[PDB]
Amino acid sequence: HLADHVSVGETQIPKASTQHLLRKAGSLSAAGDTEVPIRGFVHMKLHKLVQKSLLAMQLAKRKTIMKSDVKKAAELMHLPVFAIPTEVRSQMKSTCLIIPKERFRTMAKEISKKEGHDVHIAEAALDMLQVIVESCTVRLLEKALVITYSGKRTRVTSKDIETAFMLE
Amino acid sequence: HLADHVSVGETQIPKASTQHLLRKAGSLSAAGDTEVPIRGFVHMKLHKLVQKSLLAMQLAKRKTIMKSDVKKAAELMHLPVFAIPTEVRSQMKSTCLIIPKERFRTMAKEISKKEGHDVHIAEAALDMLQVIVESCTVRLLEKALVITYSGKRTRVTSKDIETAFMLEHGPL
Amino acid sequence: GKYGLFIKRISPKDADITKESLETVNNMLVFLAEKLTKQANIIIDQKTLRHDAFLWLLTDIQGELGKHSQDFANSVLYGEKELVFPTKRTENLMRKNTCLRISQSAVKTLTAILEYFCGQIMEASFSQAKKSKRKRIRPIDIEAAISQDKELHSMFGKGVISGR
Amino acid sequence: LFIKRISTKESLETVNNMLVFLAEKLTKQANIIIDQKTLRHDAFLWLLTDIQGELGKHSQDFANSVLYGEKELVFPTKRTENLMRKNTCLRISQSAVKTLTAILEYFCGQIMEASFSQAKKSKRKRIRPIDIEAAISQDKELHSMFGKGVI
DNA sequence: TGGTCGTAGACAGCTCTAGCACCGCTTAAACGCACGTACGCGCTGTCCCCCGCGTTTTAACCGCCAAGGGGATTACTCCCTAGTCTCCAGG
DNA sequence: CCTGGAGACTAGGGAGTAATCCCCTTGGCGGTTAAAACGCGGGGGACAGCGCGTACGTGCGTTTAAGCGGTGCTAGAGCTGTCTACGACCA
């Protein structure tokens, strides 16, 4: 269960992000407890990605993550990234980042410190992490949504979300 | 959907074989129409695999497939395998395989004929084919059983396995 | 692998394209080429690659679109049609993903299939834009368009695109 | 072929196949992750430092012990050389082959003991495919590592 | 075990630029609180279609058995391609 | 005015081709048996239907923290010349 994965001490994703994500996935409205499983999921995914990123880091002995690092991390997991560094209708057209940005730099710094490598990070890697994490989470929510329809129910539930994740 | 995949005029898997497969999945009971979706699913997987194997055979300027062609196709599906040719609860220990051998050979011959290739098949290629197909079908059936339990129900219906297929793959 | 000029050249459907979209489609095509050539490497049993191998590798692709593609390949190889992408850059990216021997005919076939998929992607984008009127093809015109067609998504899908 | 010496022809074939598959996959991962022209044992060492649990810690500790010391190293270096050279057009060194031999023999030991435990749970003194199937399914981390395959 | 041979990835030194940390401001969203209700839960009372059982055709399978056919092997030829070259005309 | 690319050849090494004998498949025939298919209460899971409170959709105020730069800065990511040191290829 993802319930044990979330802990106390690290930074908190605001709930409004959760309802916005559910609206993006097409759901009607969120339940009173759905925040914890989704926050755990996003935290664990970012943990895995940043860990593989540090794996790439240790190879070149550098101390800043470049777009090459994040793209290698994405591809070794077999994810074809296409981004480049260079009431549902109310947000269907909108494709901006739905999460505040400073929160994830704070998360990245904290997880890197927890691993034990205070390392500077560039914005392009942040954008790549943004897109990959949003894609994964919207996929998972869509899976849960079709499951909860399949149960002849018009609502989402923590049981639904965790069984959807397990179904992978 | 999946039911449309089957058509009148071709051989089919025995119904009792389907029932044994569902029991091997651990399901205590099933609906009366469960045979059709799994028949379609196994036919589709066999069709794709045999087409890919035929392509591999054609590449080598060959006239009859070997285990090498099948293993190359298997690596092609990004699906590893470690095989080399060289009441209900008291049943999972059984390793004996379900679908009869000659039925599967007839299926292969028909699906090759529909491709216009009277190509001989070696038994090692068979072994690989039925083992991989039973693996995929049992995995799909287990996922279906899980999603049925999640529905706070105790049996399985055709809509259930349809949903299971919809989740695992993408559209259509 | 910067094919943007050739994209505009092979795109007669004006509708001035966002600079980002050229990079997106460039990544799209280069990923297609990489996956399909790793495919060709894993399927072959002989040291020298052959054009007919690529032909068959595209032949199994579901639908009459594969036969259209191979017809275009025959046309460009000998029938009536020419190519616009450079051969040399394609050969370089070819060598970057194999340790085998490759002839020019395979290069011609690969350039043809790149022509073909570029044509379909640009026309689908323009059709989706026309469904949404206005002009100036945007990123949104890719998603829910690749998702619009059943076969494209059924064979490409997966790949993460900007937002969703 | 030497797994029997480490310790049922079919089970030996299965263990050899799964070992060579793991070696091939790890070599592919190492080749694709590195950016410099040649690879060192440190690359595989870091590849070890991602397996959650104390088992990965023992894996890396034993790799380090083999590098500093000798342990057993009964595996043919030439066979390993053939295995990665068949699927790599890059540069290698002997430290890497020693490390990969150590890690593969460690995995062989783990799977052997898991099979023995599973067989003893079923009251059987022989090696059979159903026992290794039950063992590989039972362990969580091995199932996560080997779930992609089938046998 | 030793010769050498090579080339190449650490190493050091420079540099300039891009993250970084803080400042500050401002204002827009997160959240907490009220209210009123839609629905998932919960229960109930009938329903009909799998599910064990039983009996009763049949054709899968195995074993043999002849047979043949094309496939792994060997031997032979050749021409196609990388692969160096080269200098030179188009860009 | 460059530069990469349009020819040139050119040989070898793989690509293409022919023969062959036997192993491995392939088709067929037969015995029968294990299995596959056809009824049967029933009863138990499913479902139509009734009832609710409570979790939650929507609305309102407020802050406080997130974003937009603004700026000084530095550190540390690249760029560029050694060398010795560690594989490779040989005895």
Author numbering:
A (entry chain D): 15 to 100, 131 to 212
B (entry chain C): 15 to 100, 131 to 216
C (entry chain B): 5 to 168
D (entry chain A): 9 to 15, 22 to 165
Question: Can you provide the manuscript's text about this entry?
Answer:
Unique among viruses, some giant viruses utilize histones to organize their genomes into nucleosomes. Melbournevirus encodes a distinct H2B-H2A histone doublet variant in addition to the canonical H4-H3 and H2B-H2A doublets.
To investigate whether the putative histone variant MV-varH2B-H2A can form viral NLPs with MV-H4-H3, we used our standard procedure to assemble nucleosomes with a 147 bp DNA fragment (Widom 601 positioning sequence). MV-varNLP contains the requisite two copies of MV-H4-H3 and MV-varH2B-H2A (although one copy is better resolved than the other), and binds DNA in the canonical superhelical configuration typical for all nucleosomes. Due to its absence in MV-varH2B-H2A, no contacts with DNA are established at SHL 4.5, even though this region maintains an overall positively charged surface. Interestingly, a conserved cysteine in the MV-varH2A L1 loop forms a disulfide bond with the second varH2A, supported by well-defined electron density, seemingly stapling together the two MV-varH2B-H2A variant moieties.
